[PDB]
Amino acid sequence: KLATIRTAGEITPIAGAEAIECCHVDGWTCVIKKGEFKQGDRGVYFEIDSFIKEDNDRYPMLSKQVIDYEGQRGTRLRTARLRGQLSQGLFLPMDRFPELASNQVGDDVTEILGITKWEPPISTNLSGEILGEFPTFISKTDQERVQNLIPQIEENKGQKFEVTVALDGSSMTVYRKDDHIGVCGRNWELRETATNAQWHAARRNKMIEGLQFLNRNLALQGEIIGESIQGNLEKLKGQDFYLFDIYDIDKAQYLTPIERQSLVKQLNDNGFTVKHVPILDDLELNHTAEQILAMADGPSLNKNVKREGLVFKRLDGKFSFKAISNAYLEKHKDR
Numbered sequence: 001k002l003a004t005i006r007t008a009g010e011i012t013p014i015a016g017a018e019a020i021e022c023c024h025v026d027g028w029t030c031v032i033k034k035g036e037f038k039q040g041d042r043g044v045y046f047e048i049d050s051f052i053k054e055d056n057d058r059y060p061m062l063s064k065q066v067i068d069y070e071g072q073r074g075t076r077l078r079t080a081r082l083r084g085q086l087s088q089g090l091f092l093p094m095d096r097f098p099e100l101a102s103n104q105v106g107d108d109v110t111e112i113l114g115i116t117k118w119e120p121p122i123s124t125n126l127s128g129e130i131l132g133e134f135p136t137f138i139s140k141t142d143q144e145r146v147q148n149l150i151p152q153i154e155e156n157k158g159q160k161f162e163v164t165v166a167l168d169g170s171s172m173t174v175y176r177k178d179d180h181i182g183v184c185g186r187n188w189e190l191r192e193t194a195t196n197a198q199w200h201a202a203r204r205n206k207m208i209e210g211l212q213f214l215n216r217n218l219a220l221q222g223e224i225i226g227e228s229i230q231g232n233l234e235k236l237k238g239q240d241f242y243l244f245d246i247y248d249i250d251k252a253q254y255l256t257p258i259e260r261q262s263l264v265k266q267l268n269d270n271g272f273t274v275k276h277v278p279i280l281d282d283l284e285l286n287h288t289a290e291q292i293l294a295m296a297d298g299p300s301l302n303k304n305v306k307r308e309g310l311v312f313k314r315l316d317g318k319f320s321f322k323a324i325s326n327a328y329l330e331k332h333k334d335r
Contacts, residue, residue: 002050002115004109010024016083018034021033022085027145027293044100047089052075053074076118120334126185128196128198131189138221145324146293152321162279165311169229169230169242172222172224173219174207175247183202206274207241207272220245223277224242225301246259283312308335309323309324
């Protein structure tokens with residue numbers, strides 16, 4: 001949903017810079033030309049991580065940021081601090097997009113506009129030998145951003161959420177399906193070799209033994225972090241796995257936070273040393289997205305570094321979201 005038709009929110013002046021103003025778009029704030037929008041106007045909002053192919057007719061404002069990425073010429077949208085105000089994304093009025101004049105507010109126009117997703121590089125240590133596709137019977141490990149969930153955030157006030165720290169590593173899944181035990185990176189199931197980091201991490205914490213012990217069709221999903229993995233924010237020696245989700249393959253749903261905490265308890269009780277991402281205090285929601293983003297800034301697993309953000313999983317287990325820390329995004333231009 002990289003490029004969607006959205007609505008200009010509150011529009012606040014850039015005290016000092018007359019040619020620009022700051023436009024609220026859902027939970028996002030975005031710098032625009034003065035007068036480009038009034039509140040209530042529609043436009044195409046391109047989220048950060050959008051990759052937009054070179055085009056000086058439609059996107060002259062991105063000309064000086066064109067780069068070479070996976071074979072194409074385009075610009076990557078990322079967090080910036082333009083003239084004292086945080087800016088994320090690009091918001092262009094509907095009249096610049098004549099082929100969308102019959103689309104509706106909220107339409108996903110990513111495919112029609114030719115927008116692709118920028119992603120950081122896969123860590124050199126982690127692209128082992130591919131055995132097969134990521135299993136279609138397991139869900140991948142992504143979360144919608146709080147900035148895109150303004151109505152759902154009001155809906156869910158008072159509801160309680162498990163609050164966990166997001167770690168800056170690489171997604172890893174270790175699963176059992178009947179007589180098969182498998183290890184996956186973010187997009188692929190991997191073959192066990194001596195140098196495969198994900199398999200190594202799964203053997204050392206004995207989580208394959210733990211899945212054989214538990215005797216259920218489960219996928220243990222989490223982050224592998226540490227040296228030579230995405231800059232090693234947390235200052236580990238070596239590498240380790242930190243669980244954040246357990247997916248029930250037979251029922252095709254995630255375990256609730258309490259379900260998942262109990263099982264990790266029992267695994268550790270039996271010698272299966274499976275670590276879990278830092279679990280903060282349960283949060284009773286009654287916050288704006290702005291406030292949740294403010295919570296996101298803080299210490300990580302290593303308490304002397306700025307964490308990537310927070311993940312919020314409602315205690316019944318079927319509503320989750322993430323709040324990435326903007327302090328973190330300002331510090332890490334590769335994020």
